[PDB]
Design a protein around this ligand. Structure first.
Ligand code: OGA
Ligand code: MG
Ligand code: NI
Ligand code: ZN
Length: 331
């Protein structure tokens, strides 16, 4: 069995190996990469996502989210307070202001310490989930707006033809902006490219151990657990590495830098934070190996998780017994 300790693997494809996306995912899985729940892919030196970022300040963040925390430093939830629209140029200047900028620090480890010590005491503003792409249309390799769609994968594997579309999303971050513990919708893969700016630190639980994380989350967030049997779908709960280690939960951590891709694998719980002003692009995708995870994915039916148009068909075809209850939650 490859990668039995479920370590995060780092790949360096050649320009030739970067041509065929599906083939390279299958290669990484041949080497056991999926066991970690997360992999890093460093693009060949010849590749570029686009020529420059000199022209992005006019992108609109229609609904910036202020991430307000409640709890204790290692175990907290966050709620998203909607703020007035602002441009990416306006947001970058806010990120760089004295109130929001990254503090002086020695290295990534010191900055991680400061994040877990002090996150709850601030409310950073996140530009999340903005439909769009920063890949040049002429970038042919690993262009997140030109991937095979999840609807097409389901049709190729299962024969069924369904509505829905699959497009990328932009994330503009600042110091302390936070992504809560979650798996993807329908336990899909994700791919995330850090276009520019400061790093993103990731934490991940191996898929084979995901239920250990869920059981701890039920203990740590007991009212949330009574409210919903899949409350991590709400994407609001944080648990620190110190707390995870105290409770014996297997996990790993890695820092993504600008120019690097991360892949999350089906049912790989992940969480993390941004080091400073940055911009990432991410999209969900599927492979044949996903289908069995899609069929078993938990679902939020309490009404909180509220998701995309395209998830309807995935529930309806893969989980027909759950469809009626889940759709009541959506409506
Ligand atoms: O970058 C972020 O804020 C969060 N992204 C992801 O959870 C992802 O790519 O799967
Ligand atoms: Mg612009
Ligand atoms: Ni994710
Ligand atoms: Zn719920």
């Amino acid at each position: 069995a490859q990668n039995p300790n479920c370590n995060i693997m780092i790949f360096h494809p050649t320009k030739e190996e970067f041509n065929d996306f599906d083939k390279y995912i299958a290669y990484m899985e041949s080497q056991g990469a999926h066991r970690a729940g997360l992999a890093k892919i460093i693009p060949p030196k010849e590749w570029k996502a686009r020529e420059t970022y000199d022209n992005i300040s006019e992108i609109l963040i229609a609904t910036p989210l202020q991430q307000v925390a409640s709890g204790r430093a290692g175990v907290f939830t966050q709620y998203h307070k909607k703020k007035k629209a602002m441009t990416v140029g306006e947001y970058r200047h806010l990120a760089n202001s004295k109130k929001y900028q990254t503090p002086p620090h020695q290295n990534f480890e010191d900055l991680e310490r400061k994040y877990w010590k002090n996150r709850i005491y601030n409310s950073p503003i996140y530009g999340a989930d903005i439909s769009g792409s920063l890949f040049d249309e002429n970038t042919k390799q690993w262009n997140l707006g030109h991937l095979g769609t999840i609807q097409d994968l389901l049709e190729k594997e299962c024969g069924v033809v369904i509505e829905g579309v699959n497009t990328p999303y932009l994330y503009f971050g600042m110091w302390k902006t936070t992504f809560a513990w979650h798996t993807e919708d329908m336990d899909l893969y994700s791919i995330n490219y850090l276009h520019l700016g400061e790093p993103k630190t990731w934490y991940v639980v191996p898929p084979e151990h995901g239920q250990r994380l869920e059981r701890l989350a039920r203990e740590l967030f007991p009212g949330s657990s009574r409210g919903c049997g899949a409350f991590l779908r709400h994407k609001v709960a944080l648990i620190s590495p110190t707390v995870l280690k105290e409770n014996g939960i297997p996990f790993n951590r890695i820092t993504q830098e600008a120019g690097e891709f991360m892949v999350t694998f089906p049912y790989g719980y992940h969480a993390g934070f941004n080091h400073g002003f940055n911009c990432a692009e991410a999209i969900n995708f599927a492979t044949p190996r996903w289908i069995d995870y899609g069929k078993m994915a938990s679902q939020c039916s309490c009404g909180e998780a509220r998701v995309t148009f395209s998830m309807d068909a995935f529930v309806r075809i893969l989980q027909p017994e759950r469809y009626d209850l889940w759709k009541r939650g959506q409506d």
